[PDB]
């Protein structure tokens, strides 16, 4: 209907609760392995944030896997920063991590993150 | 870190994708039964929006159920309107449905929805 009212803060309040569930390991259904490191998450949140995870978890075989191994070239700290961004909207971008965050966001297919990384690098040239 | 940047639209863009997954029946993990009607959903979204579903899906036995039956007094249209609100932030509140939406929101423990229903009823007295 075109006669709906809207609760402004609803989407933000939902995302905060999804991050609380992740913190407490409640109903997490996949482990992402990045070299020696492991990260527990919810497949639906990963798909909602990333073109790579959307493709993986809509595949008729990969949708049922409980472990996904990323390319060995991916930096674990870069992945951790992006997983935190998926669950909070906040990106911890610093001089010391920007190259790893940008390469990881290109692999994960997160376009707006790639674009702000490019802008911050260009400003320092 | 206190040095994070924030993408304003991120939470809203995530919620839109969760509703698209529900529309296409992708990775839905529970059926909610309301008398003769059935509704497919994601347990994590239900818990993030409702005090009743948060209690149900954190229980050591009920967390593993694939079907949940609601009280026979609950109106299916009232439940459908609230499920759509959970996945969109938009509430289709009308003269013809407000009493059923308010009773359903009290049962589901959705406080801000109960509060706007009370305000709209009081204005018509």
């Amino acid at each position: 209907a075109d006669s709906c009212i809207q609760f402004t803060r609803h989407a933000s309040d939902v995302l905060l609760n999804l991050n609380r569930l992740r913190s407490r390991d409640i109903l997490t259904d996949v482990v992402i392995v990045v070299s020696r490191e492991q990260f527990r998450a919810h497949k639906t949140v990963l798909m909602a944030c990333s073109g790579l995870f959307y493709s993986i978890f809509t595949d008729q075989l990969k949708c049922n896997l409980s472990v996904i191994n990323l390319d060995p070239e991916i930096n674990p700290e870069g992945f951790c920063i992006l997983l935190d961004f998926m669950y909070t909207s906040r990106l911890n971008l610093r001089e010391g991590n920007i190259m790893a965050v940008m390469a990881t966001a290109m692999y994960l297919q997160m376009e707006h993150v790639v674009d702000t990384c490019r802008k911050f690098i260009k400003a320092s040239e | 870190a206190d040095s994070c940047i924030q993408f304003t639209r991120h939470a809203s863009d995530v919620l839109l994708n969760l509703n698209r997954l529900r529309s296409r029946d992708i990775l839905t993990d529970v059926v909610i039964v309301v008398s003769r009607e059935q509704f497919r959903a994601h347990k994590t979204v239900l818990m993030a929006c409702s005090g009743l579903f948060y209690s149900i899906f954190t229980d050591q036995l009920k967390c593993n159920l694939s079907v949940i039956n609601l009280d026979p007094e609950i109106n299916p249209e009232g439940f459908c309107i609230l499920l759509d609100f959970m996945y969109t932030s938009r509430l289709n509140l009308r003269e013809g449905n407000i009493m059923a939406v308010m009773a359903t929101a009290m049962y589901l423990q959705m406080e801000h929805v109960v509060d706007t229903c009370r305000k709209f009823i009081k204005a018509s007295e």
Binding site: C4, I5, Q6, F7, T8, R9 | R90, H112, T116
Partner: peptide, 5 residues
């Protein structure tokens, strides 16, 4: 909160 979207 509530608004007209």
């Amino acid at each position: 909160a509530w608004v007209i979207p």
